From a paper:
Human cytomegalovirus (CMV) has ‘hijacked’ a relatively ligand-specific human GPCR, and repurposed it through evolution to serve as a highly cross-reactive ‘chemokine sink’ as a mechanism to subvert host immunity. US28 binds with high affinity to many CC-type chemokines, in addition to CX3CL1. US28 signals constitutively via the G protein Gq, and cells expressing US28 exhibit constitutive cell migration, which is thought to principally occur through β-arrestin signaling. Single chain fusions of US28 with intracellularly directed nanobodies (Nb7 or Nb11) enable purification of stable, apo-US28 that can be used to stain yeast cells displaying chemokine on their surface, thereby solving the general problem of structural instability of GPCRs purified in apo form.
To assess the impact of ligand binding on the structure and dimensions of the US28 ligand binding pocket, we determined the crystal structure of apo-US28Nb7 without an extracellular ligand to 3.5 Å resolution. In contrast to the chemokine-bound structures, access to the extracellular binding cavity of US28 is significantly constricted in apo-US28, where ECL1 and ECL2 collapse inward. CX3CL1 displaces ECL1 and ECL2 away from the receptor core, uncovering the binding pocket but causing minimal overall distortion. Conversely, CX3CL1.35 distorts TM1, TM6, and TM7 away from the receptor core, resulting in an expanded binding pocket. US28 was truncated by 10 amino acids at the N-terminus and 44 amino acids at the C-terminus. The protein was concentrated to 28 mg ml−1, aliquoted, and flash-frozen before crystallization trials.
Residue numbers in the entry: 22 to 315, 997 to 1122
Write the structure that this text describes.
């Protein structure tokens, strides 16, 4: 035999604290993500869909931590039926978190390098598929863990000794090798394009994508590197004393809790690294528990054209395009400002196709796009004298989520002096 009674009892108090830490910040940060994109605003692009789904996978994960904490406090208190069920939510939430993390890069891969964009309706459908794929891939990971023994876990007293090895290989490549290979290749292809583009945020874009990979490695690699030498023990390629298995168990415990911190960093790696999500969160925090908050060129410029004077009921076509080579723009829109009034949105269209019009112009104006040329046109039929304002063109950028691309502004006058 080989006893492990003292190693688990000495690591338990350290593990219980970090669990509470991961449960505290992970539940707050991942609730704010969902709350920011759905409160007093709606879903805009295909990234928000995957962001919510990633936050949903993290919430389901973090909600198991208080149950895991009650398990260490009293080992017996967890029965069979809850342990298999609690373990089911653990792996399903883990694989879906990894599935959607990979989908972040791919959707931004096809959008940046290949200029193919997915609308929200398609992104929701794929999200359903990813949850299904995460469940079917988690079946062999909890069906063996349904042991209400002294310690709930694999407990491979039965099954062949190669069964944990196949499960580790499937776990090592499915949860680390394949995800890290895709997001490294995707963000490398993207970074080498942005660094040469004319984007005014090209510096921070690459630094954002680099942070995603580093945090993913320094938090997941220690756990899979420890599973690698554990699989080496099962393969009988290396020797293992009783003490060696105890050192390997303690290394498994600490590095596994390290991987649990990754679900607390996902809000800081995708969502709240963007200025638009920071400003949107700052307004939500402002109504309740925060204070209301109260280059410029020589790069990419928005060429505007189509303004002029026209009688009431006439027609105009506004045109806007990017004067540089930028590949990180995912949406553009039109804004106007009447004398003595504030700047208001009139028509916004994303490169996925989802359009959004203002109340006063809906049914009269029609906004259209061109992805390959980064151009957006606004057909203004049945013009009214109330539409007399200075129309500005705006462009939005991906990853960093900035909308500081503005045009010079074109004039649209309807109510003027006309003779018989």
């Amino acid at each position: 035999p080989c006893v492990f009674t003292d190693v688990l009892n000495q690591s338990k108090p350290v593990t219980l604290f970090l669990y509470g830490v991961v449960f505290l910040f992970g539940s707050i940060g991942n609730f704010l993500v969902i709350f920011t994109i759905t409160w007093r605003r709606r879903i805009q692009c295909s990234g928000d869909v995957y962001f919510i789904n990633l936050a949903a996978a993290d919430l389901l994960f973090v909600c198991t931590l208080p149950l895991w904490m009650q398990y260490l406090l009293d080992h017996n208190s967890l029965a069979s039926v809850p342990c298999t069920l609690l373990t089911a939510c653990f792996y399903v939430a883990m694989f879906a978190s990894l599935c959607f993390i990979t989908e972040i890069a791919l959707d931004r891969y096809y959008a940046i390098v290949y200029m193919r964009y997915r609308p929200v309706k398609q992104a929701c459908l794929f999200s359903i598929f990813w949850w299904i794929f995460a469940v079917i891939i988690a079946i062999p990971h909890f069906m063996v863990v349904t042991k209400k023994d002294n310690q709930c876990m694999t407990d491979y007293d039965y099954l062949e000794v190669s069964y944990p090895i196949i499960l580790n290989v499937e776990l090592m490549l499915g949860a680390f090798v394949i995800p890290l290979s895709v997001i490294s290749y995707c963000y490398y292809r993207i970074s080498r394009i942005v660094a040469v583009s004319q984007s005014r945020h090209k510096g921070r874009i690459v630094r954002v994508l680099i942070a995603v990979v580093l945090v993913f490695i320094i938090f997941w690699l220690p756990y899979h590197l420890t599973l690698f030498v554990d699989t080496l023990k099962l393969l009988k390629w290396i020797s293992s004393s009783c003490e060696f298995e105890r050192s390997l168990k303690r290394a498994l415990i600490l590095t596994e809790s390290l991987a649990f911190c990754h679900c607390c960093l996902n809000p800081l790696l995708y969502v709240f690294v963007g200025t638009k999500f920071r400003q949107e969160l700052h307004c939500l925090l402002a109504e309740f528990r925060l204070v209301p908050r109260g280059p410029r060129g020589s790069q990419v410029q928005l060429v505007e054209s189509g303004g002029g004077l026209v009688r009431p009921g006439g027609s105009l076509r506004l045109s806007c395009a990017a004067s540089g080579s930028i590949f990180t723009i995912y949406a553009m829109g039109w804004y106007r400002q009447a004398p003595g009034k504030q700047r208001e949105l009139v028509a916004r269209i994303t490169f996925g196709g989802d359009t959004n019009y203002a109340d006063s112009v809906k049914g009269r104006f029609t906004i259209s796009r061109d992805n390959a040329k980064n151009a957006v046109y606004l057909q203004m039929n049945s013009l009214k004298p109330e539409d007399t304002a200075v129309y500005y063109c705006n462009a939005e950028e991906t990853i960093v989520e900035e909308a500081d691309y503005w045009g010079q502004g074109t004039q649209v006058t309807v109510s003027s002096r006309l003779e018989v």
